[PDB]
Structures are given as structure tokens and as C-alpha cells.
Amino acid sequence: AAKIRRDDEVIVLTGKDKGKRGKVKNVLSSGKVIVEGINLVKKHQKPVPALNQPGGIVEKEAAIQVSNVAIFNAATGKADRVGFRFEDGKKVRFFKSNSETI
Amino acid sequence: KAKELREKSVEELNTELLNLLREQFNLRMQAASGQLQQSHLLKQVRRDVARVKTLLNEKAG
């Protein structure tokens, strides 16, 4: 079971933008995550008529190590960790600092 | 869609096989003449023929 999932809301632990928050956009098999407006890069982009018409520079999100983000509680307003238990037949996830299901 | 055809008669899906096969052919041609933008289709019929011929295979046996 994966502790953090698509459409979770997380706080960055590590790197150029430590401390700031965002939504999970999609989750890579390398064990990385795209997080909306977090690990922004400036890709130089060549022109090509059929797909991505113009040249130009781009900002886009770069994958970030999933170990470097934490489910964000929004009750303490702080990072947290995730356990696993059964709420009546179905495995669920709970914060540990404040043992409520998510 | 295995259960949807597990029950139907030997002859019933013996006729199902042939019009699957016919569609496969028609796809093949339109694909070959750049008149198929839905590539995924011809993969699906292939897997349908597969699971017909299996169902034939258990009943007959």
C-alpha cells in the first residue's frame, strides 16, 4: 500500500522549496511524484509544427522524491506520517500524531 | 465479458466467432489504408477471438 496517493495535499520536507505545500498531480513508478507548482524548471523548447507548435521557454514541474514530501495534516497545520488499519473490513490510512483516519 | 458468453450455446458463439473474425478483417484493411485513428480497436477484437475460442474449447471438451 502506498502512503501518499494521487490528489493528496502534501508539504515538502527537503530541497529548493522546503516548507511549502501542494497537491499531488500524478505518481511515478520510479517512486517520484509531480506536485502542482513545486519543483519548477525552465525547459528550453525547440519549435515543431505538428505538436507543441512554437519554440519558446517553458516552466513545468519536475518529479520529486516521494520520500521528500509528507501528507499535510491541516488540523495541526504540520507534516505527518501514515499508518494502516482496518476501519470495518477496508484497510485505511490514519495520521499518527492525532490518530484520525484520512 | 466471459460470463456474458459462458452460458450461450455452442452454435450461438460458433456464430459469434465468425462475425468477430469478419470485423478483424475489416479493421485490418482500413488500418492498412490510413483510415483508422482508433488503433486500440483491432487489439480488442484479437483478445475477443481469444476468449471465444477458449470458451468453445472447454464446452467441446
Binding site: - | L21, Q24, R28, M29
Partner: protein
């Protein structure tokens, strides 16, 4: 006679070309790309049926796959069979 399942396999595509175009609009011949093991008789049958035309004769030949490179790799395309299928008199398709 040939079972139809077989017939649905033996035709694989139409084959375009300068030569195929011309053959069509000169000696009323359609140029197909067919199953490697399909006899002339099976082709004639399969066309007559699956396109509802009438076939005078089919000719066949075997095309050899060209050898290629893909960056210091040696490759080889597959051999494939090419049918010239002359229809009867006045059909078109």
C-alpha cells in the same frame, strides 16, 4: 471448398505503388499483400467472396526482406508475398 475462417486470414492488405496504380488503370489488376502460405487458389476464392468481384487469374511472387542497420545493429525485415489479381472485364472496386 475453403472454409471462410481461412479466407479471412489470407488477404492482409492492399499494396499501393506507382506500379499498382498503373496496373489497376490499364490491365484491371489489383495488387494485394497476402499471407505467406496462401496458394493462388485460396487468394482467388478469398477475393471473389470478400469483395464480391469476379477474378480472371491471380499471379504471386515472394518479396525478400531487406537487411537494415539500426546503429551498429544488423536487422532483417520479413519476407512477404505479393499478389497481382486481375479481375474480369468490368468490375472495379
Amino acid at each position: 471448398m475453403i472454409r471462410e475462417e481461412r479466407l479471412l486470414k489470407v488477404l492482409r492488405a492492399p499494396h499501393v505503388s506507382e506500379k499498382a496504380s498503373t496496373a489497376m488503370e490499364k490491365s484491371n489488376t489489383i495488387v494485394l499483400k497476402v499471407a505467406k502460405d496462401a496458394t493462388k487458389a485460396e487468394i482467388k476464392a478469398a477475393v471473389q467472396k470478400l469483395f464480391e468481384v469476379e477474378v480472371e487469374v491471380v499471379n504471386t511472387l515472394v518479396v525478400k526482406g531487406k537487411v537494415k542497420r539500426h546503429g551498429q545493429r544488423i536487422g532483417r525485415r520479413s519476407d512477404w508475398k505479393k499478389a497481382y489479381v486481375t479481375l474480369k472485364e468490368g468490375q472495379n472496386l
